[PDB]
Amino acid sequence: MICSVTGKPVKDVLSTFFKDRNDVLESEVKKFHLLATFEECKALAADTARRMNEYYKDVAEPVTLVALLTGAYLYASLLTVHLTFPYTLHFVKVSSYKGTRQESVVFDEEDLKQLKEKREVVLIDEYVDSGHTIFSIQEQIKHAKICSCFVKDVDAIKKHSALADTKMFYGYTPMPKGSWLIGFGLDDNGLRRGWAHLFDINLSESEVTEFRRRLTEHIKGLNINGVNRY
Amino acid sequence: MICSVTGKPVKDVLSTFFKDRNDVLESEVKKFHLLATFEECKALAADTARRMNEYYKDVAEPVTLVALLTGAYLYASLLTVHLTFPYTLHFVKVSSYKGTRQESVVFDEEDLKQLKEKREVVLIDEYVDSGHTIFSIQEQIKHAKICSCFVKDVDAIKKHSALADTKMFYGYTPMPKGSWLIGFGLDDNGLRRGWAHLFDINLSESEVTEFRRRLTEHIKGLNINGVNRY
Ligand SMILES: Nc1nc2c([C@@H]3N[C@H](COP(=O)(O)O)[C@@H](O)[C@H]3O)c[nH]c2c(=O)[nH]1
Ligand SMILES: Nc1nc2c([C@@H]3N[C@H](COP(=O)(O)O)[C@@H](O)[C@H]3O)c[nH]c2c(=O)[nH]1
Ligand SMILES: [Mg+2]
Ligand SMILES: [Mg+2]
Structure with a gap:
């Protein structure tokens, strides 16, 4: 339930993400399940660059x-x-x-x-x-x-x-x-490509939790120190 | 002499950038004049988003x-x-x-x-x-x-x-x-688009120093704290 790169609880990543947006109705927010935080995606990309x-x-x-x-x-x-x-x-x-x-x-x-x-x-x-x-x-x-x-x-x-x-x-x-993924560049019927975190809209809570359990352990075991020079 | 976003000495930003690269010769490193660090570019982009x-x-x-x-x-x-x-x-x-x-x-x-x-x-x-x-x-x-x-x-x-x-x-x-800019997506005759910092290859040290003085002044007065939710 925590970002494997920053340590920020997912609920906090999402409270920050969804604060006062003009591209999603409050009633629709719950439809988006976070699979990977943007920082986690960045780690994956850096590891691939490596x-x-x-x-x-x-x-x-x-x-x-x-x-x-x-x-x-x-x-x-x-x-x-x-x-x-x-x-x-x-x-x-x-x-x-x-x-x-x-x-x-x-x-x-x-x-x-x-x-x-x-x-x-x-x-x-x-x-x-x-x-x-x-x-x-x-x-x-x-x-x-x-x-x-x-x-x-x-x-x-x-x-x-x-x-x-x-x-x-x-x-x-x-x-x-x-x-069914949206975000991280993937569109939601043309929209939300810039929602940087990778979201899913079709999985059960348990499935999302299991995915994150595996992703988190994978990211924690990465060695990409130095890859990012910025 | 420093990144107006991170406060890190540009000398160190550059040494970190150029350490053990395979896309530029040692003799060529001095050809690139840093105009804006990737972090400074990200601040400017965040301002346009805001x-x-x-x-x-x-x-x-x-x-x-x-x-x-x-x-x-x-x-x-x-x-x-x-x-x-x-x-x-x-x-x-x-x-x-x-x-x-x-x-x-x-x-x-x-x-x-x-x-x-x-x-x-x-x-x-x-x-x-x-x-x-x-x-x-x-x-x-x-x-x-x-x-x-x-x-x-x-x-x-x-x-x-x-x-x-x-x-x-x-x-x-x-x-x-x-x-003549290269980096930050701009090519150096097709190459180096991924050099995220914005470099110039035509200016003198004094011209570059003067540009950064003005850029620094602009960025320090920037109000984007919060635009980034990630
Ligand atoms: N928004 C959203 N797009 C795709 C796609 C789009 N199709 C492309 C290629 O798919 P495939 O490998 O099935 O041929 C993907 O790179 C992507 O752009 C596949 N799955 C999804 C998904 O779950 N969500
Ligand atoms: N490498 C490098 N490319 C450009 C360009 C490229 N030309 C495009 C349009 O330029 P302009 O406004 O002159 O028509 C830009 O979108 C950019 O990609 C302009 N100036 C430079 C420069 O100094 N360096
Ligand atoms: Mg694709
Ligand atoms: Mg698509």
Whole structure:
């Protein structure tokens, strides 16, 4: 029931968060269940930056980092500020096409052409849920690597032979089945992307408590001293 | 000589920033002149959030925020997390077309159609310099408002009758004549966007010292204690 980074009780994090806002009705506040505080998310992103930094410390050409609009902007901002190897960064807009046999990510022809040319290309997304998105991107850019703050089920992803070899840098896994997340850049029907904490609106209290129990112990065991230079 | 937010000697902020990096050579470190620490930039962004929050406290419909790729991703992340009114967020990767008579911003037909329909549209940019970008967007979306962390010369921008009425929210102005900024999302020829502190690579030590004196004066008089809820 306490933030694993600051030590502030979640009730206090939320009392501060919800004080006199103009973007949520008092009656709606209870609908939002905090899964991870913004500070906890920042720790996860820093830990991910740490691993990418170690991986690319000797790279001889800038890495191509590419983030998918729009939600990943926040995570990308929390990740990139801690990276210490050369890279370029750009964002691309893709559309999800739900076919009768599979869901596919449709890129701008030019964007895709450019990416397929780079040796080191890392797709940044804040959340890998069903994995259909990265599964599609993967089959279009076979050498692409993935960097995601949250991954619902890594094992499920690795089950696919196509992704079994793909390098993935992620902050935390697994995420609760039956959840629906908003905040941390993810929209609530277009709104609240800037609600920095990661909230859920579909889980039971017990499920939220269990998720935090596991997240908290994971964060307390992290060693990211020095990663943040600011 | 110190960060106007943390009180830490800039010399130490920089030594911490540059210790064991893999994205700059030792001989190149002196090329970067610190203009504003990441913390100072965060204070300026919080101030713009505070002002936007007051302006839109009674908005009846979601405000349309449009951030200009690529550089605005960091500032947008630092601004949106503190906004307390409803809004949607979109990034536009418009293309700059340098004509023989003027430079114009080319939008995706659909993106432009959508924006021109919304009553409240705010363009988010980390830095408005020559102003050609917003000047173009302005004549295409005449009702667009601007929210920029840094502005080279506000006085100069208002010189244009077309922009003389455009509502502008900004963190700080003016920026040093002849400066070239990198960091805080701005690229150094594609690289270093994640260097969160705002650096310049053209100014003399005395020019930089003078800029920080003025920035310091502004930040110390800043009233944002409370804007950050995280
Ligand atoms: N608001 C909110 N968005 C998503 C998404 C959106 N779909 C993207 C890719 O999903 P997937 O892995 O299922 O293909 C995510 O990166 C995210 O932007 C998945 N799950 C959720 C969720 O619970 N909440
Ligand atoms: N690296 C680095 N980029 C810019 C820019 C980029 N150009 C864009 C628009 O500029 P302007 O106002 O001149 O049209 C900005 O959004 C910014 O990303 C302006 N000035 C600088 C600078 O000094 N340095
Ligand atoms: Mg996503
Ligand atoms: Mg979404």
